[PDB]
Design a protein around this ligand. Structure first.
Ligand SMILES: [Mg+2]
Ligand SMILES: [Mg+2]
Lengths: 239, 239
DNA sequence: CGCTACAGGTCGTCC
DNA sequence: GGACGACGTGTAGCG
């Protein structure tokens, strides 16, 4: 239990069970290379036929099944799921989440490798360049929008929806910003339009919307213009 | 090397280099257990300090870095990225994505395990209970919407945006359907309202919007009612 | 929990 | 290759 790694290739069932169950009691990452079938029923339902895949069970219950292509797991289970290992015609990894009820079944036809990784990590990700940091830059230097802009509220719930920044201009109008940390799309403009309309019905037609993004799509421009909304070019800042 | 799996615990640098090399040449899966540092720069910028993680490099270029928590990799690179291994003071995995330019740098301070898995998988996931299945059901069976509903188009570009289902009703009105495979939120109603207004521009007051979904959030229902749009309860079929 | 919206979203289709 | 929207989206904030 004091080795970081414990690896077995071509494990016997006995060896499988021993390492699987120690991974769980030790709350260590479990990794397995195997030929398997996968059955999922839950929010949706899926079958994956027999094939080789990497399987990972994290100590927090996160379950991953990866094919040899793409970024997404072909199947998974979220944190807080519970897995048991089941002996049947083959060993079967069964993971269940409660609410909503989702079942993942991994039938292990052939286990090429099983491993316990007792991983120590006290460190957490520090990311910069987010939308939240655009909001900060704007409250710290409102001029990046325009002279006299005064930011007032961040994530202000209006009647229906939550607007990213609510504010006032030099004419004393209410100003909605919608921020995107990347090229803004039709859905961004729909957010803004939706918020502005809701405000307009309280505060009159003078309410301004501004989409604040590094750029926007052909579609966003068209709809923005058609709706009389505005665009300010802003890049997400990186610390 | 002719084996499906090769595993070396506590590799030397030469051992490390060798397996990494083979994984890439053999189009195999590369899995590393390591204490590392991660530096990422690209669409955003991030730093992860020294800690233990699982690393996976797929033969299609997908790069994954997993902490012992959550379902998401703490850092990654998408399919198509090119990876190399540089020997600085420590070995450094470098994976770069062209377009947009993104670089991922993993300093391997200690490699606990490195493995090559030559995975054979000819099988594609088969999933049921999607939104597209809802659409099929509605074309096969339009009365699930209402009697004498005539479905005409599916994923139809209108001028700005794309409608899930476009049709007519028995009274000669045009019908927009917005479909959701799960409980519908504000986002959905905004989509629906947006399309219906665009269609009203051409066909005038004779357009109906219908949100089709297993249920609604409070905000959705509120907004839906406000704009006088309609709801039909439908569960995605599991076939 | 339920609502709401962001994400380095990823992914697939189709103009 | 851009635009557009679904996704078993996952994840975080907030009430
Ligand atoms: Mg917003
Ligand atoms: Mg839609």
């Amino acid at each position: 239990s004091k080795d970081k790694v414990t690896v077995i290739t071509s494990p016997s069932t006995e060896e499988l069970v021993s390492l699987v169950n120690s991974a769980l009691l030790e709350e260590a990452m479990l990794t397995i290379f195997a030929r398997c079938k996968v059955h999922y029923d839950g929010r949706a339902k899926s079958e994956l036929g027999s094939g080789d895949r990497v399987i990972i069970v994290k100590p927090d219950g996160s379950f991953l099944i990866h094919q040899s292509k793409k970024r997404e797991p072909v199947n998974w289970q979220p944190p807080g799921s519970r897995v048991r290992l089941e002996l049947r015609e083959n060993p079967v990894l069964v993971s269940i989440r409660r609410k909503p009820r989702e079942t993942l079944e991994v039938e292990l036809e052939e286990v090429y490798m099983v491993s316990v990784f007792r991983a120590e990590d006290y460190e957490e990700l520090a990311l910069t360049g987010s939308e939240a940091e655009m909001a900060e830059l704007i409250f710290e230097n409102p001029e990046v929008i325009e002279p006299g802009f005064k930011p007032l509220f961040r994530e202000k719930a209006i009647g229906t929806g939550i607007v990213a920044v609510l504010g006032r201009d030099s004419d004393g109008n209410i100003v909605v910003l919608e921020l995107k940390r990347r090229r803004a799309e039709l859905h961004a403009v729909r957010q803004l339009k939706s918020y502005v309309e809701i405000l307009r019905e309280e505060y009159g037609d003078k309410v301004r919307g501004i989409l604040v993004a590094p750029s926007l799509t052909s579609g966003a421009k068209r709809l923005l213009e058609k709706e009389g909304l505005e665009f300010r070019k802003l890049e997400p800042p990186k610390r």
